[PDB]
Amino acid sequence: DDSASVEVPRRATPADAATVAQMLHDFNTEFGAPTPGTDELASRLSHLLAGEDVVVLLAGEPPTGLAVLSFRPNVWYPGPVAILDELYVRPGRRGHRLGSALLAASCGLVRSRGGALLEINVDGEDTDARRFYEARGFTNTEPNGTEPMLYYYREL
Amino acid sequence: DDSASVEVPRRATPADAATVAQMLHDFNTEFGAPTPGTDELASRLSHLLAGEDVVVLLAGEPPTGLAVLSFRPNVWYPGPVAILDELYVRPGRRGHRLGSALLAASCGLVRSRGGALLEINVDGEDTDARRFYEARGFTNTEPNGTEPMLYYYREL
Ligand SMILES: [Cl-]
Known part of the structure; x- marks a missing residue:
């Protein structure tokens, strides 16, 4: 009863491709975001999870977050630069705890890879995500900066 | 009565490591940004330029931009997602022309690699850069979005 510590997220292996595919699918469809089918996602993940370029961490047993x-190289750093591409947890106190654990495990993994920078792109309208990251060491302004750095994209 | 109207940026190869390192260092020092030394940069570039993960395009002969x-993988796309990590050109008409040429070439390369998305992180204060990118098909808001998408980072 007192024996167990707080759950530490685990790294998804290639054997987890189907699990991860279904979670990515379900998270999107429940919030109205478009998604490929689980056959496509699973196939892609059987590739990605076999490498070190995209890494997936799982929280819960069964996993619920x-x-x-x-990871990518960068001309200014000896190690990789990482992006938190996604952090998917259920709304509410439960999900938020798991999210907090997943973020901490992500920072550790980045450090282990010799990375010194973790980036995120966040919708400005998403006040909940902004409050969450800002409480855990992230900023959208440089120290000698006066206003928010912006994410721009072009679909090609 | 022979030449092309416009010159086409070329891809930097491992032979260009010293050149690129000098240009990165000089741009930073000229505009007050910290930089590693050229030795460190040239050594890193001698690795990166032999790969496909970080690509450097050069404009001008001798190059002046x-x-x-x-490039990185992404769970949602079959091809890579690309970031314009840097676009270094001088102020004024001339650099703007080179910058435009370099951006067009960058889009073509990303498309050639099967990439459907090119991302940039831009200081909100940098109005001239924002106008330049917005004139060339970049947006900072999602289609059904209110307000700017933001870049967040955490040093580790
Ligand atoms: Cl929100």
């Missing part, structure tokens, strides 16, 4: 990290 | 692109 996940984090997706991507 | 450059673009740095990074």
Whole structure:
């Protein structure tokens, strides 16, 4: 009863491709975000989870939350730069605890890879996510900056 | 009565490591940004330029502008997602022309790699850069979105 510590997220292996595919699917469809089918996602994940470029962390048994990290090189750093591509947890106190655990595990994994920077792109309208990251060491302004850094994209 | 109207940026190869390192260092020092030394940069570039993960495009002969692109996988796409990590050109008409040429070339390369998305993180204060990118098909708000999408980071 007192024996167990707080659950530590685990890294998804290739054997988890179907699990992860279904979680990614379900998280999107429940909140009205578009998604590929689970056959496509599972196939892609059987690739990605076999490598080190995109890493997926799972929280819960059965898993009920996940984090997706991507790594890339950068001309200014000896190690990779990481992005928190996704952090998917249920709304409410439960999900928020798991989210907090997943974020901490992500920072550890980035450090282990020799990374010194973790990035996120966040919708400005998403006050809940902004409050959550800002409480856990993230900023959208540089120290000598006067206003928010912006995410721009172009679909090609 | 021979030449092309416009010159086409070229991809930096491992032979260009010293050149690129010098240009990165000089741009930073000229505009007051911290930089590693050229030795460190040239060494890192001698690795990166031999790969496909970070690509450097050069404009001018001798080169006077450059673009740095990074590529990574993503759970939602079959192809990579690309970031315009840097676009370094001088102020004024001339640099703006080179910058426009470099951005067009960058889009073509990303498309050639099967990429359907090019991302940029831009200081909200940098009005001239925002106008330049918005004139060339970039947006900071999702289609059905109110307000700016934001870049967050945490140093580790
Ligand atoms: Cl919100």
